[PDB]
Amino acid sequence: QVQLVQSGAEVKKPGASVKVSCKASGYTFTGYYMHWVRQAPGQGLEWMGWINPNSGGTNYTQMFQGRVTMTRDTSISTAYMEVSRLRSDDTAVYYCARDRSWAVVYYYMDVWGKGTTVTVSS
Amino acid sequence: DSFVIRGDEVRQIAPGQTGKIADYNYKLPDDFTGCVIAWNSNNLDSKVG
Amino acid sequence: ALTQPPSASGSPGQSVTISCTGTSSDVGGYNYVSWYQQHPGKAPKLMIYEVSKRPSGVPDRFSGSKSGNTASLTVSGLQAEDEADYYCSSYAGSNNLVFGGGTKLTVL
Ligand SMILES: *[C@@H]1O[C@H](CO)[C@@H](O[C@@H]2O[C@H](CO)[C@@H](O)[C@H](O)[C@H]2NC(C)=O)[C@H](O)[C@H]1NC(C)=O
Numbered sequence: 001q002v003q004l005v006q007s008g009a010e011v012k013k014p015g016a017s018v019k020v021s022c023k024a025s026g027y028t029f030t031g032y033y034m035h036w037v038r039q040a041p042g043q044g045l046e047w048m049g050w051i052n053p054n055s056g057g058t059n060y061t062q063m064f065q066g067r068v069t070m071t072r073d074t075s076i077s078t079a080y081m082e083v084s085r086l087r088s089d090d091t092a093v094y095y096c097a098r099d100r101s102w103a104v105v106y107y108y109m110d111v112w113g114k115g116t117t118v119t120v121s122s
Numbered sequence: 123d124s125f126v127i128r129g130d131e132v133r134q135i136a137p138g139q140t141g142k143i144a145d146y147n148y149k150l151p152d153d154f155t156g157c158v159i160a161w162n163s164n165n166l167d168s169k170v171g
Numbered sequence: 172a173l174t175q176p177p178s179a180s181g182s183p184g185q186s187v188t189i190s191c192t193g194t195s196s197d198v199g200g201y202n203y204v205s206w207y208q209q210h211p212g213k214a215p216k217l218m219i220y221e222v223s224k225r226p227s228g229v230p231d232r233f234s235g236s237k238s239g240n241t242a243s244l245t246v247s248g249l250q251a252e253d254e255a256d257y258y259c260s261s262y263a264g265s266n267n268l269v270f271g272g273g274t275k276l277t278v279l
Contacts, residue, residue: 043272044272046269046270047268095214100217105266106203106221108221108260109217110217112216115213115214
């Protein structure tokens with residue numbers, strides 16, 4: 001069992017913040033990287049960034065650079081992704097995804113979370 | 123010296139051995155004079171997750 | 172991002188393909204050009220990772236190669252289990268992955 005138990009849906013006002021958690025289980029949490037990838041319900045799939053529990057080094061796309069901050073928590077074996085301003089363009093389900101490789105950032109992911117929805121209100 | 127290593131890696135701490143620990147963490151020279159001492163510490167240095 | 176054709180047809184027991192295009196540091200640029208299969212309402216799972224190889228548990232009926240400055244993931248002998256979106260991917264350089272739009276494998 002390598003399932004990633006991810007938090008439930010959240011509803012946030014426009015412009016406000018939100019943080020989403022993924023609780024890792026089964027596999028060794030320290031080694032394998034954790035990418036963050038978003039899917040708007042209307043279209044496609046877009047990647048944001050990753051944070052590795054082995055080091056804490058974080059990288060992002062240019063689009064989300066500065067606007068979003070990521071962090072780890074090895075005590076409960078979980079990773080947190082914070083979005084500062086829940087803009088209405090960011091209403092999406094947010095998938096956390098484990099990289100398929102041991103200690104390299106190589107960009108392909110095996111196992112994905114069950115789906116944490118996020119909504120921007122009106 | 124003092125360190126904590128994985129259980130199958132205790133054979134690596136010996137002169138002339140090769141591996142990840144023996145080549146990247148702690149290398150004993152081939153002319154080593156001394157004793158290597160180890161014991162299991164699963165019940166005293168580990169926690170669930 | 173990776174420009175991509177929108178759809179592909181088929182029927183159970185046939186052959187079909189889904190392509191992803193781009194060359195400037197795109198899918199034709201590097202070798203880490205993995206694909207994914209996403210059903211609606213559930214998480215996706217990667218069926219073709221780097222260039223041509225398949226993960227453990229993936230059926231061998233899927234195939235993939237760069238075929239130049241592009242990509243192609245095919246399906247042979249499709250069934251009801253193989254209809255989903257299919258997203259290409261790449262490095263695209265300097266720690267900035269980009270995905271494609273996604274073609275929906277539809278069987279008549
Ligand atoms: C993620 O990695 C990329 C790849 O190096 C970083 O992009 C470079 O960052 C340096 C920082 O001084 C800039 O001088 C370069 O111009 C950047 N390169 C490009 C192509 O933009 C990026 O900064 C990293 N991000 C984080 C948060 O570490």
